[PDB]
Design a protein around this ligand. Structure first.
Ligand SMILES: [Cl-]
Ligand SMILES: [Zn+2]
Ligand SMILES: [Zn+2]
Ligand SMILES: [Zn+2]
Ligand SMILES: [Zn+2]
Ligand SMILES: [Zn+2]
Ligand SMILES: [Zn+2]
Lengths: 352, 352, 352, 352
């Protein structure tokens, strides 16, 4: 079958593989729509997560179930499904510890294009269908729905880890797709002031749509200075790190109040370490909590985000700046993420 | 000074009182806008808090500071302020335990119209102004602002106690002012489906405005079955008990899932019994948590909710269906509250 | 195979039954040590969970794996294991919400002598072995280990739900086996003062051993007054409800401070409803949280408590007052539990 | 009065000052026992808090109340008290935010030998006696009580921030006084295995006394590998960084499980960067939470810790390896704290 894959670090191309087969609890799905992530880049051209050979890429898909194993009870061929980007093995200690994301090891809950073939093929394999698939209501358009497997769950998890109090001020550092869902997330947790950091025109516009009350552009002076200025030297209650480089940690620590919380949902691809600024961190005694986590996956997560979309609590369609048709265009869409132009938030490819 | 008081159970009337003077840490404040509450009614006519004599009523005001003590540092004569319904003593062990609402006694954080003269007076006394007042921005209309001291903080506390998860389903029982803020609060915590229970058309309209996706009334017999039917016998994640009788508790337990949470923000002042239905409560082992708490007060709570209004995360003006003008219409607004007309949610009296 | 079974409400006896076989993921186990529980007594003589027919009793066992299904990876014939009283289906939505106790339904995680034959049998069936068994270190004596599956997980979950702060004061109501692990559990959460309510001499000695600094007995059914006096009218921070009738709820609420927490680990099998004392619960506004939940089960829970025993953080053997040897003595053990002698805490049949 | 003071960076000596006088809410206290801290050392010799001139040193004392202001209700001349190292101003926004340690700014809760004269004087000033002192029971010996103001509150906060689960494994890095209270703290939160990293024999013996089940030292090479070996490649649930340089941060991140918690209770100064290793931190997505906080102070904290001492939940007397008599030996104890002999944990000076 056709599949667009990371041949080796630095090389990508269309390969051919055996169409996969489902174990008793598994499902085979064909993609209806897919999206590329900057994470696919951080790993192909930067090896942020080690080397690989011939690994079909991509982990954001809505699809149609084409086959299920004999033990699968809730899905059958023909069902339209949202496939979470994280599809954990649900029978592990990590799951008993309440961290399915790390079922089987650090980040191991994230399988597609981390440790198994991704969704950029004619077909793909989902482990444990009943636990890891969600039904797609026909109301919700494909392009919107494909923002759910990853962008929405990551962004919102940023808000969730931040433990936002009603009325509190939040800075979201980065306003790409993830940062934009970070903003929407923070609003849906009751944030008052939300300050987005970024400069892309399309992103600024979307940031305001999602609930940003202020936008800071690096071109107008340093972010910390700008935030301290906006908050009259008081800083903010919460910071969500969604995008940018490792220097954003230091920025987040300098902006946040003592006793506050920093929530990293930014996948850090380069550098050995991240510096925490000693003084601004109260030398380790400022109660400035640093959190950071891979997005939740599985059926329940998807079903919950789907509800939010269904009851119109969030509209992820504004995230999709580019739509193309057909397999051939997965490459185009992939490269668009590598050399991200000024008008890009998230590309989506719709299959026939 | 002039003041609308409770003379005794069942009796209210205009009386003459000594205008209060501030201690070193206090402020005297004159009302700019007040609103009478369901609680004042129950207090007067149903002996909800026991007998009182010549106690000035009302606990919901925005106002102007007219005098401050020698140690007050942040507020000064002429300042427009939101006055929280709850104005704790901040130097107690309850406060060190993190329960200012119960500083110096159960619910002792609530002073106005309880243990001290309330705000239906030419002036009133705010203890510890620096800790118990918030500056009110000019941008916010008085009628909106005066919903903050009680309705908004109470209703939102309900959503807070409920510990709503993103996408989870919520029932709010009672759709008066507090339940409406309960609905708005639940939406701001990221709730998917929000079921409101109540029947007054003005309230149902508002309930929908604030995020209710479904409305139900007992007018079809028994509420629990109706909820179970809406939810396919699954129940809901969270129940907020905002208005109604003590039977409400039993209904909430029955409606909510195992592991769920029920939160009460209704002062049960009648002698009706609070019953937990044994079976529906899994014999006390269903992890159906039961919470109930007097609304937060003090400066920080008010500042945070003011930000919610300011940045347009909530629009509480919908609660305000009647507006009167001039100190004397207090009595009219209070009477109006006593014989609840069908078009009434919340009346406000704006002072000249 | 031979089993000790509920024949019908009111009637027990030895029965012969087909030896169970394992599914792909299951294990068949033989008891090495077993203990009867009050729950066994009630199920049979008070119909507590409804009518059962030829259902093998008992849910507390240390055992040895005799056979495993083809997919079992971590356990094999000969492995000595601790078997949790709670053995959930791990592939359900409840598990995804973090409530394995209620996987597939309220309290559905409890299977032994409820929905399936319990452990008082020559063999018993354990669903999902890899998720529901824990290797037993040789260093731990059987009589100690057998307190883990229910007594220790339950008592400790009382202390857990109680969210105890360091140095805080705790009342444990009921000083039977479960209450005593509640006392031990509270000490292991950093509690300062621990007040045990009860009178039975062997239980009082044991309560002291596990951390109680004070013992009180009901005078003529009354207890709240004695606690207030102990604490100079301040009351206590936390109350764990471990034994006694529904009326201990009112007692817990009256003893606990505003903003405190009450945790129920006591099964209530009688009466339509539990009554909350309105006045003492601050008419629903005193932030006196009411929690209650079936003990955690599964592998990890057992492994954790095993470590507590192994590292000598708690010594459960003092719960064990009577030790019989031999399978046929299950009947004796059970009747000893039915006829609760004054010197009895828990009996243990050691087969081995 | 006489006082032992920081003259200037790198210089210390005895000076003469005016005896402090109480504001209305304040108390004047004479030391009955004092302890020098490692922070008085950095302050003096590393300028860790900036330039100071004639500032009396020390922030650990138990004393007797000599004088109270007119507003002090709960303490009177003659009263023996434990004085918290952290004595915040209780009327601030930060206190309303729940962070008294940062009342009025980052670490501003810590006043003694920071922004006001410390306890190494014939008298010292305590702001807000009623919120900031606790009565000291005769039962508790002076040398032991003096470990409460800072050592115990700090170690235990390490354990609190770490959110230890029952039976979880904990590594405490550093087994100086604070690390030792960290170990005891972890035991009191229900830790199973506790691994202490250190090498000084007296410290190793105290570590074992306080609950360490294993002891590792750097002089067996690199710490992480050893921990992974002890845990068979699994790592630990929790890490408390109580001592050592900043590279401890990277070791802690590397040894903790995905989803784990790291808590810092060590003051990082001088010149070692706080670095988070990217790979071991899962590129910021391994849910390895990093916390760090100044110890709680105030009356309630001290009262709770006094209770744990009173009820024999912990015996801090083991931290005191050196006791001297005489106000004058304050210098000797200080220098002893500077050049740190192999046999020193904590020294105490006992006054007449
Ligand atoms: Cl009683
Ligand atoms: Zn991604
Ligand atoms: Zn924090
Ligand atoms: Zn719950
Ligand atoms: Zn509470
Ligand atoms: Zn110190
Ligand atoms: Zn974590």
């Amino acid at each position: 079958m056709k599949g667009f894959a990371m041949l080796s670090i630095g090389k990508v191309g269309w390969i051919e593989k055996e169409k996969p087969a489902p174990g008793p609890f598994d499902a085979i799905v064909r993609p209806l729509a897919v999206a590329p992530c900057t994470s696919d880049i951080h790993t192909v051209f930067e090896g942020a997560i080690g080397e690989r050979h011939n690994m079909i890429l991509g982990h954001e898909a809505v699809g149609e179930v084409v086959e299920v194993g004999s033990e699968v009870k809730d899905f059958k061929p023909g069902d339209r499904v949202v496939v979470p980007a994280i599809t954990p093995d649900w029978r592990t200690s990590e799951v008993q510890r309440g961290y399915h994301q790390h079922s089987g090891g650090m980040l191991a809950g994230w399988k597609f294009s981390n440790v198994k073939d991704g969704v950029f093929g004619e077909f793909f394999h989902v482990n444990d269908a009943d636990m890891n698939l969600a039904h797609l209501p026909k109301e919700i358009p494909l392009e919107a729905a494909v923002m759910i497997p990853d962008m929405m769950t990551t962004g919102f998890h940023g808000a969730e880890l931040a433990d936002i109090q009603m009325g509190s001020s939040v800075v979201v550092i980065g306003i790409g797709a993830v940062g934009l869902m970070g903003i929407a997330g923070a609003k849906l947790r009751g944030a008052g002031r939300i300050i987005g950091v970024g400069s892309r025109p399309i992103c600024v516009e979307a940031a305001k749509f999602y609930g940003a009350t202020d936008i800071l552009n690096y071109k107008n002076g340093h972010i910390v200075d700008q935030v301290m200025k906006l908050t009259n030297g008081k800083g903010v209650d919460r910071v969500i790190m969604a995008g940018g480089g490792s220097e954003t940690l230091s920025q987040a620590v300098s902006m946040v109040k003592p006793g506050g919380i920093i929530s990293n949902i930014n996948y850090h691809g380069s550098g050995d370490a991240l510096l925490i600024p000693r003084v601004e961190w109260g030398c380790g005694m400022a109660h400035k909590t640093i959190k950071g986590g891979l997005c939740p996956g599985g059926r329940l997560r998807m079903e919950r985000l789907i509800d939010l979309v269904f009851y119109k609590r969030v509209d992820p369609s504004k995230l999709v700046t580019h739509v193309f048709r057909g397999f051939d265009n997965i490459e185009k869409a992939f490269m668009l993420m590598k050399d991200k132009p000024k008008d890009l938030i998230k590309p989506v490819v719709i299959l026939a």
